[PDB]
Design a protein around this ligand. Structure first.
Ligand SMILES: O=C(O)[C@H]1CNC[C@@H](O)[C@@H]1O
Length: 456
């Protein structure tokens, strides 16, 4: 009983070109206490990253970046060698952790195995400028300028107070003075050090003035986004997660204006569904795959340079869960990122939906792939409506579909893409071949499902 909608692809309606390093992940800086985690020996986690993209960015930072201390003198402890640092829950101070040379050496090997680039947090909330300069120098020495994309000087400095790291009076002017002291110290040790900031959610009292003041000193603007609003908000449900988020649209417009004003591109350096490490029954469900895959394309269409989904440990919202000792597994959100991975890079095209007011949470994105083939990514985020999509504007002898599926929107497991789960070490191949019947094509999609179409 599907809602019958039209999708019109326009090869002449050119959007943004998706860069090859758009995808990415974000982790807590505390995880650097364990030299076995980001290590060339961690072949399982490296494989999960390679399946998400041949290029991509690993961001290390988060709330734990204010509680983590580089020590050039130190060696990892026995406890460090088993630490699994999941997303910080933001209720109280994180434990103090130490980063060692060995952990940085191992990170460099992990980046070589994955092919990903690095955004590395430095400790401006509690550390010293001179120790930041020393840490930056060792990271540059060992990771190298080609793989290091940016240092960041503090995570979410607008929330230092709420987290008890600065007094209530801390404001942009105070942070700018700290940023400049750190920047100057680091550039004495590392004259080519690249920076990004301010590593927080778009706002008018921090991110806009940061860009104006530091536009010649950073390579790009770094923003955060959680779909969950303030603690007072109508609480996050799956139903709400599938709906447009007007705050996201406004903050994105704000970042585009900053780019117009300053020349600085923007990257979403930390995002996930719900804050405080996620919400059980929302963040760890198949709805999060639909949400994440759709977000990747929404932000790419808006001109973002990339994204980094926060995670680690066994956090509710982590894309990849696990440890070196116990192994790693793809959680539901991973599968939305995997659909984006399989689509590949290229230039976005016009893809207009009609007759869709009874299926309003269906989204669609059309792509001219770098290999010249047209792809369409569809997210049927309607929880109660199947759709039948009449596709016009594509001329091809053959279309195939890979489906992103689970039996219920709130499933924590049972998620497949292309008729297969992801296996060990990120192993994935499609197991189900489905042609799209065809001028025009007609695609059915179940309620709460996704699809990737590829045309020959
Ligand atoms: O609250 C969250 O879930 C995240 C918010 N941004 C900072 C992260 O350390 C934290 O884990």
């Amino acid at each position: 009983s599907p809602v019958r909608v039209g999708l019109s692809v326009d090869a002449s309606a050119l959007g943004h070109t998706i860069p090859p390093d758009y995808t990415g992940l974000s982790y807590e800086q505390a995880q650097m206490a364990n030299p076995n985690y980001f290590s060339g020996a961690n072949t399982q986690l490296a494989g999960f990253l390679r399946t998400l993209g041949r290029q991509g960015v690993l961001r290390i930072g988060g709330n734990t970046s204010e509680y983590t201390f580089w020590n050039r003198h130190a060696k990892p402890t026995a406890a460090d060698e088993h630490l699994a640092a999941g997303p910080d829950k933001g209720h109280h101070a994180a434990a103090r952790e130490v980063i060692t040379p060995e952990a940085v050496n191992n990170l460099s090997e992990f980046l070589d195995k994955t092919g990903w680039k690095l955004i590395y947090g430095l400790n401006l909330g509690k550390g010293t400028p001179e120790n930041a300069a020393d840490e930056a120098a060792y990271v540059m020495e060992t990771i190298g300028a080609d793989r290091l994309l940016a240092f960041q000087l503090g995570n979410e400095p607008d929330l230092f107070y709420r987290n008890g790291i600065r007094p209530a009076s801390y404001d942009f002017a105070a942070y700018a003075g700290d940023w400049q002291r750190f920047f100057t110290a680091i550039r004495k040790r590392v004259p080519n050090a690249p920076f990004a900031g301010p590593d927080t959610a778009y706002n008018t009292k921090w991110l806009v003035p940061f860009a104006d003041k530091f536009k010649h000193d950073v390579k790009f603007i770094s923003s955060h986004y959680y779909a969950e609003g303030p603690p007072t908000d109508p609480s996050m449900t799956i139903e709400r997660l599938m709906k447009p988020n007007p705050r996201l649209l406004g903050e994105t417009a704000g970042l585009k204006q900053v780019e117009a004003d300053t020349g600085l591109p923007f990257r979403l350096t930390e995002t996930n569904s719900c804050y405080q490490g996620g919400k059980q029954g929302v963040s760890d469900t198949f709805a999060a795959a639909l949400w994440a895959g759709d977000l990747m394309y929404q932000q790419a269409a808006a001109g973002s340079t990339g994204i980094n989904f926060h995670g680690g440990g066994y956090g509710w919202y982590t894309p990849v869960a696990g440890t070196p000792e116990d192994g790693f597994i793809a959680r539901p959100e991973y599968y939305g990122m995997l659909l984006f991975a399989q689509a590949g890079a290229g230039q976005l095209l016009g893809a207009k939906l009609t007759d869709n007011s009874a299926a309003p949470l269906l989204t669609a994105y059309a792509l001219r792939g770098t290999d010249g083939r047209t792809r369409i990514a569809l997210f049927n985020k309607n929880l109660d409506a199947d759709v039948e999509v009449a596709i016009s504007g594509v001329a091809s002898p053959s279309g195939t579909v890979l489906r992103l599926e689970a039996p219920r929107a709130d499933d924590t497991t049972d998620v497949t893409f292309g008729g297969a789960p992801v296996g060990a070490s990120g192993s994935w191949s499609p197991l189900v071949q489905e042609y799209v019947p065809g001028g025009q094509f007609v695609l059915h999609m179940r309620k709460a499902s996704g699809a990737l179409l590829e045309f020959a």
